[PDB]
């Protein structure tokens, strides 16, 4: 319908999910699609538990964690959440820089200046039409190859152990369960939005795995080589990226104002790109595992606050196993990070 589709295209609209559902297809092919499944399901749990708690004993999570926790722990959770929104804005400026260099070819510094003056410009239907049009653009090839061979033969979970194998999956599932959706008639619109746009992500990844897996060539991490051919569809990919970044800017920075009030300070990572010693293309995926490390700190308070003062949320089945599986995975990739 016209509601959940726009709510979905806007709901994802970040460079991180583009830049990790196009790495999983270039290295771990269809065998990674499953995580995207697990990426949405628990997420559709979590936000529901936020909608299940956001009206009863009404307050956003930053208002709650200031009510009954020690002060040093409040400073620690503000370090954690501020590094979370900081890393999200790093994702915004990075992806928008790669987009501006993907269009006019401007250096990422001048691209960051243009994103600064677009932050000046911020003070809708066309953006959702761009992410909707690239979303249908990846629904052009959601049909395209071996529907029962590589697909369902890889949606069943593999226990792969390698550093990059679990690192990239942790980046994907750490980018989908965005920490700022946890800081929050309505349930159906979001279950269908995240539902269909889950097909946008499985489409993006599967097409990223069928477009070139065994072909080798230049890696898909740059996103400059991510323009798939059916000419103008490439510029459509770059404009879709730029729109996704510029909108995730306002949404994630206003959300950072919600977590922060209860501007340029998050722009310091935005110019770490000038370090020149390492290329930015794949520090965005890291930007989604660091963002992943800020998820348990955003999940424990919901899990514990859900069952005291309020009705509903008595179910503690999958919603509590997901946090311990989550933390054991991120402690696998964190305890092997040396």
């Amino acid at each position, epitope marked *: 319908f016209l509601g959940p589709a726009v709510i979905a295209s806007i709901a994802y609209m970040d460079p991180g999910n583009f830049a990790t559902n196009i790495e999983g297809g270039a290295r771990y092919g269809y065998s990674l699609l499953w995580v995207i499944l697990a990426a949405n399901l628990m997420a559709m749990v979590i936000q529901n538990l936020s909608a299940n708690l956001g009206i009863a004993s009404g307050r956003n999570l930053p208002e709650l964690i200031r009510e009954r926790w020690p002060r040093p722990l409040v400073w620690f959770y503000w370090i954690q959440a501020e590094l979370v929104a900081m890393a999200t804005d790093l994702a915004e400026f990075l992806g928008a820089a790669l987009a501006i260099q993907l269009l006019t070819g401007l250096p990422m510094f001048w691209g960051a200046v243009v994103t600064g003056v677009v932050t000046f410009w911020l003070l809708e239907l066309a953006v959702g039409a761009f992410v909707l049009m690239i979303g249908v653009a990846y629904l052009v090839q959601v049909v395209l190859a*071996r529907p029962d061979l590589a697909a369902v033969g890889a949606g069943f979970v593999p226990r792969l152990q390698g550093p990059g194998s679990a690192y990239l999956a942790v980046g994907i599932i750490g980018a989908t369960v965005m920490p700022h959706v946890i800081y929050l008639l309505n349930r159906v619109d979001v279950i269908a939005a995240m539902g269909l746009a889950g097909l946008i992500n499985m489409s993006m990844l599967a097409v990223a795995a069928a477009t070139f897996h*065994g*072909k080798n060539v230049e890696n898909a991490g740059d996103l400059t080589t991510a323009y798939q051919t059916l000419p103008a569809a490439s510029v459509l990919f770059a404009v879709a990226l730029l729109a996704s970044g510029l909108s995730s800017s306002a949404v994630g920075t206003m959300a950072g104002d919600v977590i922060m009030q209860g501007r340029l300070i998050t722009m310091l990572p935005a110019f770490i790109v000038i370090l020149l010693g390492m290329d930015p293309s794949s520090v965005l995926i890291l930007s989604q595992v660091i963002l992943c490390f800020g998820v348990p700190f955003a999940l424990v308070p919901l899990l514990l606050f859900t069952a005291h003062h309020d009705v509903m949320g008595a179910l503690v089945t999958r919603r509590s196993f997901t946090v311990i599986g989550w933390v054991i995975a991120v402690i696998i990739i964190a305890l092997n990070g040396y």
Partner: antibody
Amino acid sequence: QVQLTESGPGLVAPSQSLSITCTVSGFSLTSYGVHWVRQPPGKGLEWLVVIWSDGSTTYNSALKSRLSISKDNSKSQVFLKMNSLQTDDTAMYYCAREPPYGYWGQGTTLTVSS
Amino acid sequence: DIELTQSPATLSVTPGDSVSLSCRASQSISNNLHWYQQKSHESPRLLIKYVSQSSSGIPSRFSGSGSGTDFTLSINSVETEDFGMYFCQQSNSWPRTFGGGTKLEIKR
């Protein structure tokens, strides 16, 4: 200088087993997928199988359930292996790996007759 | 399951006149195709990636031209060092499929 080299030629009886060593040099084997290409004495060739690094074997339907592909990153060797009955498939085998292809091995001769 | 019929099967040239190999497809495969030269008892170095971009370390004599369901390699002034086999490989979909091949020969 990027370079691939293979195992020495082999002559085996029918219903025997065999293996071939496609060892690599000059590139990061753990970062590239190796394809196998079989050329009979002069009767064209068709794509065989691909082993993506970290063990990901995909066999074609033509040569499935007979061939197997081991990998050893410790010495960066890509092992080809044939067991079962041998039914005198006799050919020179090839391996390939580089972002656009174009770095193939010298090939290895393999003859089967009793 | 896509195939690639390659014609002509064998080709004679003086050398001097330009030759043009045809690698007809079974269905559309986009610009996913590879051109290889080969000599007797040798490993085939890559010539043409994607039918348009000439591959790394390849003389400007060769040029691939084509679009869609069929593609053609073309050599101008054969130069006595382009004789022998030529193979053609799609790479878009499993299984990868090589062409019928051609053996270029000297003509007199």
